[PDB]
C-alpha cells in the first residue's frame, strides 16, 4: 500500500530525473560539437522573420522591432508584420512600425484564410520591401497563415522564424535557431529557448525558473531524441516545405481555444511530427518574454493550458505511435506526469487521514532535500546563484496547479467565476481544514521521546529554512539584486519615455 506507493514514487522519479539530466547533457554536448565545426560568417540559409500580435503595448512592440533589427544574421530576406485588426485603435501598432521600419503598410479588405485565392500575390506585389498587413480582426491563427503565404511566394527563402510581438531576441538568436536545420536534412523545425525578463514579483521569479528548468530538461531530452513537441512561439524555426505542406490541415482544424488569441502552435508541431520529420531544440537561441504577476490570471491560464495539455497529449500519443523504435518517449513523459499527479494526490490524502508526525517529517525532509538538489543543479547549469529560489516553487505549485488540473478534468468530464475559482477556493478550504485537524489531533508535548523531539526539530528546521529564504528574497528586492539586467535598462528606457 503506502510502502509500495512510496517505493514506486522514489524509484520511478529518480530514474526519470536521471534520464532527463543525462539526455540534456548529451544533447548539449552534441549541439556544441555540431556548432564547433561550422565556418565563421555562415549565412547559407535564407530566412524570413514573421511577427504577429494584437493589442500589444507600443513600447514592447518597438523594443521587439529594434531587437529584430539588431540581429547579426546576414541572410535575412524580409520582415513580415501582421496585425489582427483594422480599427482606429489598431493603427497605433502600424504607426509604431513605421517609426522603426519602412512605411509600406497595406490594409487589405479580405482575409486569405476565408478567400478563394489563398496565394500571397493577391495582397502583395513586391517582395524586396518589407510589408505590413492590417487584416480584419479574425484571430492569431489567421495572422500566421498570412505570414506563411507571404513568405512562401518568394522561392529565395528556405526557412521562417516565428516570434511574438513582445519577444526580445539576442544578436545571434536567429543564426543559432536556423543553423541546426542544415546540419541534418531530416530536421524541419528548431525550438528556441525562452526567458522571462521581469522578475519583480515572487510569482514571476518562480515561473521564470520553472520555465528555465523545463527548457533545460524536457526540451533538452526531446532534442536529443529528435522528437521535440514544444515548438513554436515565442521563438522557433520552420522550414518552408513542411509549412507549405501542413498549412491547410492546420487552418482547417476546428478551434475551440481562446477567442482571437492563443494561436495553435501545438497542432502545427503535431502535424510535423506525424509525418515522420525529426525536430531538434537548441538553448543557444535566447528569447525574452513577460509573465503575468496575478495569481488568479496564473491559475486560469494554467487551467486552460491543462485542458490543452490533455487534448495534445492524446493527439501526440496518436501521432507518435508511428515511429516504431522511437516516439515512445512522449508517451513515457505522459505516463510520468499522470502518475506523478496521482501519487501527489494520494500522498496528500494519506497524510491528511493518518495524521502522524513521524511520517510527515520524513516526507517533508525528503521533499526539501530533492528540491534543494534540483535547485543546486539548476544553479550549476545556469551559473547563477539566484536559482536557489526554486525551493519556493513547491508552495505555489501545490496551491495553484492542483486546482487548475482538477478544474480542467471537471470541465471535460463526461457563473463565470463559479467554474474558474470555486474549485480553487474549495481546495484551499479543504487544505486548511486538513491542517487544522492535523494540528488538533497531534496537539501534545513530550520531550522524553526521541521521535517527538526529532519530528519537532525537523519541523523547526524546515520553517527556519523557509523563513531564511523568504528574508533573503525580501532583502534582495530592496537591493534590486534579483532584478534582471535586461529589466533594469528597460525600466530606465520606459522612465525616459
Amino acid at each position, epitope marked *: 500500500s503506502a510502502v509500495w506507493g512510496i517505493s514506486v514514487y522514489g524509484v520511478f522519479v529518480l530514474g526519470f530525473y536521471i534520464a532527463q539530466i543525462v539526455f540534456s547533457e548529451f544533447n548539449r554536448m552534441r549541439l556544441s560539437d555540431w556548432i564547433s565545426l561550422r565556418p565563421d560568417n555562415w549565412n547559407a540559409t535564407r530566412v524570413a522573420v514573421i511577427i504577429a500580435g494584437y493589442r500589444e503595448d507600443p513600447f514592447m512592440f518597438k523594443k521587439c522591432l529594434e531587437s529584430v533589427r539588431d540581429s547579426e544574421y546576414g541572410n535575412v530576406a524580409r520582415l513580415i508584420c501582421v496585425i489582427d485588426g483594422d480599427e482606429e485603435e489598431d493603427l497605433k501598432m502600424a504607426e509604431i512600425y513605421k517609426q522603426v521600419y519602412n512605411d509600406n503598410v497595406k490594409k487589405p479588405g479580405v482575409v486569405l484564410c476565408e478567400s478563394e485565392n489563398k496565394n500571397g500575390s493577391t495582397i502583395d506585389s513586391d517582395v524586396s520591401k518589407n510589408i505590413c498587413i492590417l487584416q480584419p480582426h479574425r484571430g492569431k491563427r489567421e495572422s500566421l497563415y498570412t505570414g506563411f503565404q507571404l513568405a512562401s511566394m518568394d522561392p529565395s527563402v528556405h526557412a521562417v522564424v516565428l516570434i511574438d510581438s513582445d519577444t526580445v531576441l539576442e544578436k545571434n538568436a536567429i543564426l543559432e535557431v536556423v543553423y541546426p536545420l542544415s546540419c541534418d536534412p531530416n530536421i524541419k523545425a528548431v525550438a528556441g529557448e525562452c526567458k522571462i525578463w521581469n522578475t519583480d514579483t515572487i510569482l514571476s521569479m518562480l515561473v521564470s525558473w520553472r520555465y528555465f528548468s523545463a527548457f533545460n530538461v524536457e526540451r533538452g531530452a526531446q532534442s536529443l531524441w529528435k522528437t521535440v513537441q514544444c515548438v513554436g512561439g515565442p521563438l522557433g524555426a520552420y522550414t518552408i516545405d513542411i509549412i507549405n505542406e501542413i498549412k491547410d490541415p492546420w487552418i482547417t482544424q476546428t478551434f475551440l481555444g481562446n477567442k482571437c488569441t492563443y494561436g495553435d502552435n501545438r497542432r502545427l508541431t503535431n502535424e510535423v511530427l506525424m509525418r515522420g520529420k525529426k525536430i531538434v531544440y537548441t538553448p543557444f537561441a535566447v528569447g525574452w518574454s513577460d509573465s503575468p504577476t496575478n495569481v488568479m490570471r496564473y491559475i486560469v491560464q494554467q487551467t486552460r493550458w491543462s485542458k490543452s495539455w490533455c487534448r495534445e497529449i492524446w493527439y501526440t500519443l496518436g501521432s507518435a505511435w508511428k515511429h516504431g523504435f522511437s516516439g515512445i518517449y512522449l508517451a513515457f513523459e505522459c505516463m510520468y506526469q499522470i502518475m506523478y499527479f496521482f501519487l501527489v494526490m494520494y500522498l496528500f490524502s494519506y497524510i491528511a487521514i493518518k495524521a502522524d508526525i*513521524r511520517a510527515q517529517t520524513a516526507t517533508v525532509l525528503v521533499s526539501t532535500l530533492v528540491t534543494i538538489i534540483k535547485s543546486s543543479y539548476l544553479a550549476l547549469r545556469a551559473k547563477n546563484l539566484k536559482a536557489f529560489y526554486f525551493v519556493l516553487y513547491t508552495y505555489v505549485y501545490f496551491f495553484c496547479m492542483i486546482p487548475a488540473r482538477i478544474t480542467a478534468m471537471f470541465t471535460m468530464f463526461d457563473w463565470l467565476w463559479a467554474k474558474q475559482f470555486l474549485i480553487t477556493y474549495m481546495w484551499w478550504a479543504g487544505v486548511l481544514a486538513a491542517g487544522v485537524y492535523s494540528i488538533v*489531533d*497531534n*496537539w*501534545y508535548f*513530550d520531550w*522524553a*521521546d526521541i521521535q*517527538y523531539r526529532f519530528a519537532l526539530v525537523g519541523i523547526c528546521s524546515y520553517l527556519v529554512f523557509v523563513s531564511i529564504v523568504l528574508v533573503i528574497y525580501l532583502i534582495g528586492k530592496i537591493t534590486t539584486w534579483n532584478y534582471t539586467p535586461l529589466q533594469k535598462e528597460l525600466i530606465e528606457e520606459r522612465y525616459l519615455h
Partner: nanobody
Amino acid sequence: QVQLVESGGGLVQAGGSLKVSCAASGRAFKTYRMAWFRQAPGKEREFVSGISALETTYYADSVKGRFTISRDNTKNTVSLQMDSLKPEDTAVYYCAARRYGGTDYTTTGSYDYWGQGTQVTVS
C-alpha cells in the same frame, strides 16, 4: 482530564505470569503518555515501565527482558504483560498519565494523573 481505573491482579505462584489492565475515560486517549508505578509496603514508588503516544517502550531494572507494555487505542485501554514474577515484586500498582512534560518521566510529580490502583501479590 482522564480517570484511571484498574482491573486485574490476584494471587499467583512465583515464576508465573500475571496480566493487569487499566482503562481510562476521556476525549482523546491517543495523545496521552502512559506509565506504571508500584508502591512497596516499606519503600517508595519507582518507575518500572512506561509507553508514550508514539509507541516508545521504556524499561529499567531488568524489566527490559522480563515485562512487556502495550496499549490499544481502539479499546481505549492499556495493559502491562508480566512474566516470571518474583516474591519480592509483591506490591500495589498505580498507573499514571501525562499530556505535557519534559525530560523527567520517572518522578511521581511529573505525571498529573493517577488511579486507584490494584494489588498484586506473589506467592
